[PDB]
Design a protein around this motif. Structure first.
Motif, PDB file in Angstrom:
ATOM      1  N   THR A  90      38.956  32.370  28.559  1.00 48.50           N
ATOM      2  CA  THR A  90      38.977  31.574  29.691  1.00 48.50           C
ATOM      3  C   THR A  90      37.437  30.635  29.851  1.00 48.50           C
ATOM      4  O   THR A  90      36.539  31.046  29.062  1.00 48.50           O
ATOM      5  CB  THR A  90      38.850  32.326  30.911  1.00 48.50           C
ATOM      6  N   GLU A 129      36.587  32.197  38.399  1.00 49.03           N
ATOM      7  CA  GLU A 129      37.055  31.702  39.851  1.00 49.03           C
ATOM      8  C   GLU A 129      38.297  31.452  39.930  1.00 49.03           C
ATOM      9  O   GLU A 129      39.033  31.989  40.803  1.00 49.03           O
ATOM     10  CB  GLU A 129      36.139  30.332  39.769  1.00 49.03           C
ATOM     11  N   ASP A 130      39.131  30.632  38.982  1.00 48.70           N
ATOM     12  CA  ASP A 130      40.360  30.439  39.233  1.00 48.70           C
ATOM     13  C   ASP A 130      41.030  29.875  37.756  1.00 48.70           C
ATOM     14  O   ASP A 130      40.409  29.575  36.909  1.00 48.70           O
ATOM     15  CB  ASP A 130      40.738  29.228  40.345  1.00 48.70           C
ATOM     16  N   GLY A 131      42.294  29.985  37.437  1.00 47.80           N
ATOM     17  CA  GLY A 131      43.105  29.504  36.702  1.00 47.80           C
ATOM     18  C   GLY A 131      44.147  30.465  36.407  1.00 47.80           C
ATOM     19  O   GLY A 131      44.792  31.316  37.016  1.00 47.80           O
ATOM     20  N   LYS A 132      44.622  30.269  35.159  1.00 44.92           N
ATOM     21  CA  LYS A 132      45.633  31.208  34.599  1.00 44.92           C
ATOM     22  C   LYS A 132      45.459  32.881  34.769  1.00 44.92           C
ATOM     23  O   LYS A 132      45.999  33.521  35.153  1.00 44.92           O
ATOM     24  CB  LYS A 132      46.217  30.875  33.091  1.00 44.92           C
ATOM     25  N   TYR A 147      38.586  39.655  46.539  1.00 44.31           N
ATOM     26  CA  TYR A 147      38.957  38.666  47.686  1.00 44.31           C
ATOM     27  C   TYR A 147      37.725  37.814  48.252  1.00 44.31           C
ATOM     28  O   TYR A 147      37.863  37.309  49.267  1.00 44.31           O
ATOM     29  CB  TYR A 147      39.844  39.367  48.585  1.00 44.31           C
ATOM     30  N   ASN A 167      43.216  34.205  36.434  1.00 41.18           N
ATOM     31  CA  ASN A 167      42.423  34.570  37.616  1.00 41.18           C
ATOM     32  C   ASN A 167      43.069  35.890  38.416  1.00 41.18           C
ATOM     33  O   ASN A 167      42.227  36.374  39.338  1.00 41.18           O
ATOM     34  CB  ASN A 167      42.523  33.472  38.674  1.00 41.18           C
ATOM     35  N   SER A 168      44.152  36.019  38.030  1.00 36.13           N
ATOM     36  CA  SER A 168      44.588  37.481  38.878  1.00 36.13           C
ATOM     37  C   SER A 168      44.321  38.676  38.090  1.00 36.13           C
ATOM     38  O   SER A 168      44.313  38.745  36.829  1.00 36.13           O
ATOM     39  CB  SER A 168      46.468  37.410  38.885  1.00 36.13           C
ATOM     40  N   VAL A 184      35.260  31.581  47.698  1.00 29.66           N
ATOM     41  CA  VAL A 184      34.871  30.824  46.602  1.00 29.66           C
ATOM     42  C   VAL A 184      34.592  29.375  47.058  1.00 29.66           C
ATOM     43  O   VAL A 184      35.439  28.441  46.905  1.00 29.66           O
ATOM     44  CB  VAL A 184      35.793  30.837  45.318  1.00 29.66           C
ATOM     45  N   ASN A 197      36.734  28.536  32.711  1.00 27.65           N
ATOM     46  CA  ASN A 197      36.540  27.964  33.863  1.00 27.65           C
ATOM     47  C   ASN A 197      36.045  28.830  34.913  1.00 27.65           C
ATOM     48  O   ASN A 197      36.491  29.495  35.794  1.00 27.65           O
ATOM     49  CB  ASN A 197      38.118  27.525  34.702  1.00 27.65           C
ATOM     50  N   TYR A 198      34.530  28.873  34.818  1.00 21.11           N
ATOM     51  CA  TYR A 198      33.717  30.173  35.581  1.00 21.11           C
ATOM     52  C   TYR A 198      32.374  29.496  35.330  1.00 21.11           C
ATOM     53  O   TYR A 198      32.000  28.405  34.690  1.00 21.11           O
ATOM     54  CB  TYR A 198      34.064  31.353  35.215  1.00 21.11           C
TER      55      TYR A 198
END
Ligand SMILES: CCCCCCCCCCCCCCCCCC(=O)OC[C@H](COP(=O)(O)O[C@@H]1[C@H](O)[C@H](O)[C@@H](O)[C@H](O)[C@H]1O)OC(=O)CCCCCCCCCCCCCCCCC
Ligand SMILES: CCCCCCCCCCCCCCCCCC(=O)OC[C@H](COP(=O)(O)O[C@@H]1[C@H](O)[C@H](O)[C@@H](O)[C@H](O)[C@H]1O)OC(=O)CCCCCCCCCCCCCCCCC
Ligand SMILES: CCCCCCCCCCCCCC(=O)OC[C@@H](O)COP(=O)(O)O
Ligand SMILES: CCCCCCCCCCCCCC(=O)OC[C@H](O)COP(=O)(O)O
Ligand code: NA
Ligand code: NA
Lengths: 303, 294, 295, 305
Positions: C233, C206-209, D70, C211-212, D73, C235-236
């Motif tokens: 990770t 989802e998001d975090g360090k 993209y 996430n890219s 979320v 965070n998902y």
């Protein structure tokens, strides 16, 4: 099939298959076309089914043993009134049954065949492996009833060996049979040679490092041996400690050890494993054929 | 007749010690009478002698390891007596090895150009001895570099056990195979890797601005970390233009992998029958050494 | 005007049997004779000078300050500046030689990137050196990146001089053949797999360090060098999907790395021995011709 | 006569789509007239058609990747469309990717019905068709879950994305080097990886069970944790000290050493060597299989006009 399959005293199959690991040509003789066809025929007739049933039973037994051990609790421990405990103890009594069964099977093997005491550690690796597993289980029981905590070590050794023992059942399948044969040949030859050389190198270099190291955690020979071994598995730190003089000599020893072991002797193990696979194809096939022949004759004598 | 013991010149003696420059050193050893007589003499006394020598050397190495391991310079307890006697014995053994190396050098007077191609084990033993003696000199001069000279001597001594494989066939052939890589495809296959590593380390250290990886030593060691399965890829952040740094690291990784791969394809593109011949030759050398040395 | 030795040596890749035509008794004899007489000693000196130039350039680059920068009157600093001047003179010389080669031999746009590999490598290292100079005189900072790229290519091009010795020249020939043949396909397939699994993982995150797409790609690639983490990770959602994807990627990437490290041997356990030796002979012949045309 | 233009039973089509049992379905295509015809038709039109298909597939997969990465979320799908050029691009990418999934699903259903396969070699042959059908199925179930107000649409989408990105190797055919590389890959996965994985999984499960039995309790009292810890060795990241909440260090280290020596040292290098022999043994087979795969491509395109 006069004096071919059933003479009860001495026939071609019993002497060819059960001949010790001494006959010069104990492998190529089974390649006689009528004899090959006869063995394959008896296989398809009943031995395939009996072997499949035995394999299923062994897998189920080992599943039961894994379930019983994975949920292990100064023994012995009280039998609490709960379904889980009854199932655990029932699993334990089945595991002990399997151990004692294999203990008698090995005894009967050694008495009926009575090897010459010399080639007993040259062939019949599977039977000795099963006997050792059985002994591990028995010693686990003995320590368990003697109120000791080493019964866990005993039974984990038993469990690991028994799990690795399913390779025995890879026989009866062309592809997996030959694969298991190759694994065993490579264990005997290449692993042994490389292990001897590598053990000498590692012990020497660890001794040199520990002699250099003045004090601390790695002042122990065991700690320094573990650290130097961690290089071969892709985990070498190269700077585990700074408690010593002359960083130069320490780094020189570490780099010499890495170059001589990791890049040279591993590359040598791989190359020998390539040469052997390219060399012993037909030898592996013949050994597999003989293994299946031994299994067929045994199960035939087992009615 | 004048092949086993002429007392002036025999075919076995000349064939054994003919320099590497000779084309067919080990081929002619396959002559029937030569093979049979070599085997006869070996199985008559050389096997027993060689077993005894290997046992003595292994015990000596154990003694030296124990003495060096428990080092308290220079420097009334049973442990203290054991340590000192171990040190004395190790020094004596090193002196004896010095003697034997000097003796062989004088006797065969190698041409200083195949002196290194041949007599590899003799050079190794001599260098061990030179390390031990220098370790003695430093210890008795009130210095500390004696420990460095002792650890080097001990490491070479322990790794020199492979000279005693001769006398066990398969162990001998395996040892002959390792010898080949070190004296043929090691210098050559290592110069290329070293130049790659040095160049990329110089590039990275130039790219960096400042940090704990400012020195060439640290950056070179970091670039080496990949070769031992310890690639960090992020050891330094103190720089500018991240993309150039990362692309250079990827370039080095891929190139070093391809270099190793070409090493394998080149060397794996061995002998087997020549290695057996080499091992037979070294065993014959041992046979004659035992015979003359009685 | 027209000699078989100069015609064949510089003959296009369109000719079928260069690797064979050097086997002719008189041709190989005469080439060995010329080499051993004079070209061996000329090439040794040339290698000495080039290595000295690379050492000078390395020393100059290492001590770079933190443009142009004022010169403080110290002997070491004069040494530094003259080192930088020699480094630029050598780069200009290599650029001039590359341009001269492109205006003389007129590569016909087909094998231009197949043969003459060393010349193109030197030319591109010259293009890096000169663009570094242009950035430097313009008061810009990217000159450091250009300079380090040039230095890396120079130390790697050191291998061009490996020829003149059979074993090392043949090993360098193996490196070039591998780079031009097999790493190509291996890296194509590996890039496809790495990007696919990187996109899957980053979508899952989802998001975090991590996430890219870039960080995810780096973490995935870290596995090929035996520095995997498998837990980088948390965070998902659906840890099961994460573990399934990572296991599948690890298994497939090891399959691919193995398949390569095996298929290259399987295909060319044979041709390397003789074809690489012939190519080394050809490369030595070309060197002889270049040296003679340099008088 | 009646070789490729028979319209009732053509030898080329019959052999190309022949049963797996055919002893030499790969060797017969090498007949000089057959190979010449295949090359002619390829160069004439199937080269251009196949390259255009490859381009369209890559464009579709780029669009899908961009749409997914993209994604919005916020939880509890579906999500209201917010007025933005980027949002309009991201939703149209989604609706194009769904359309592509449906198209591939129908293509698979067609192949299944039209061929009328054996239902025995159906798995043994045509791996590509089933794989494409599987990604399409994942995509469609991903749409269903997205509209069904759950959170497993993302799982179904990521599985589809991974499968589709790895499916680009279907197009390796048409180029000799990468085509023969893919066919070798496929043979090697079917044989050597399968054998090694059977043995390796047995070994890993056995030793991991033994260790986790030994481990008293703590972080690594779970079978899955110990299985992952042991698997960390084969990827070259083993610890040997990841746990110390037990008794009898001797047995623990002995088990770990046995596992390392048996798997990492031995079975991995056996995989090296076995894969070496295999590749050294099956070159021409891969070449012929690749030629047949291109033959099937050409025939399918020709019947697709
Ligand atoms: C104790 C140490 C044992 C180490 C031996 C290596 C292991 C391997 O033994 O033999 C494989 C298989 C076959 O034996 P078999 O006797 O039946 O076959 C023989 C065999 O072919 C031989 O050539 C002839 O005599 C004849 O052909 C036939 O008669 O036996 C297994 O099933 C174990 C295989 C599974 C265990 C492998 C683990 C690694 C072995 C070392 C660790 C042992 C403890 C675990
Ligand atoms: C059920 C699942 C079984 C999975 C086994 C792996 C299958 C595989 O890999 O074969 C690649 C496949 C192309 O086989 P093809 O059908 O064309 O070949 C056959 C084959 O040769 C046959 O002998 C001939 O009749 C003729 O040639 C032809 O009939 O598909 C691709 O085109 C590459 C795509 C590569 C990706 C597929 C593997 C991905 C692994 C897992 C990915 C995880 C993603 C998440
Ligand atoms: C100070 C510079 C570093 C000098 C080396 C430090 C000592 C570390 C050990 C050096 C390794 C040298 C190579 C080696 O020791 O292995 C080769 C032998 O097994 C080959 O068998 P054999 O001796 O020929 O019988
Ligand atoms: C233009 C994109 C930005 C610049 C990034 C370029 C990354 C390359 C980093 C420099 C090293 C490249 C050197 C290389 O390409 O591999 C080694 C040579 O092939 C070996 O060939 P050779 O022996 O010199 O003939
Ligand atoms: Na690692
Ligand atoms: Na690694």
């Amino acid at each position: 099939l006069s004096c071919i399959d059933t003479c009860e005293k001495n026939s071609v199959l019993e002497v060819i298959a059960y001949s010790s690991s001494e006959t010069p040509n104990r492998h190529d003789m089974l390649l006689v076309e009528p004899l090959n066809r006869l063995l394959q025929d008896k296989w398809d007739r009943f031995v395939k089914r009996i072997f499949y049933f035995n394999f299923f039973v062994y897998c189920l037994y080992m599943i039961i043993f894994t379930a019983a051990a994975y949920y292990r609790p100064l023994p012995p421990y009280k039998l609490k009134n709960t379904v889980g405990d009854y199932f655990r103890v029932t699993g334990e009594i089945l595991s002990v049954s399997g151990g004692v069964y294999f203990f008698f099977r090995g005894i009967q093997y050694f008495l009926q065949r009575r090897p010459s005491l010399k080639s007993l550690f040259v062939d019949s690796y599977s039977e000795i492996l099963f006997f050792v597993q059985s002994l591990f289980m028995l010693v686990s029981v003995v320590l368990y009833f003697s109120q000791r905590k080493e019964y866990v070590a005993s039974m984990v050794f038993s469990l690991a060996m028994g799990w690795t023992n399913m390779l025995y059942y890879t026989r009866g399948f062309q592809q997996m049979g030959i694969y298991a044969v190759m694994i065993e040949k490579m264990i005997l030859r290449d692993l042994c040679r490389f292990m001897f050389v590598y053990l000498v190198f590692l012990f020497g270099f660890s001794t040199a490092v520990v002699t250099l190291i003045e004090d601390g955690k790695y002042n122990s020979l065991y700690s320094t041996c573990l650290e130097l071994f961690k290089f071969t598995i892709g985990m070498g730190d190269l700077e585990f400690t700074e408690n010593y003089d002359f960083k130069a000599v320490f780094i020189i020893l570490l780099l010499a050890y890495v170059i001589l072991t990791y890049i040279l002797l591993l590359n040598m193990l791989i190359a020998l494993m390539g040469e052997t696979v390219n060399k012993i194809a037909q030898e592996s096939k013949n050994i597999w054929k003989l293994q299946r022949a031994i299994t067929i004759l045994d199960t035939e004598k087992s009615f």
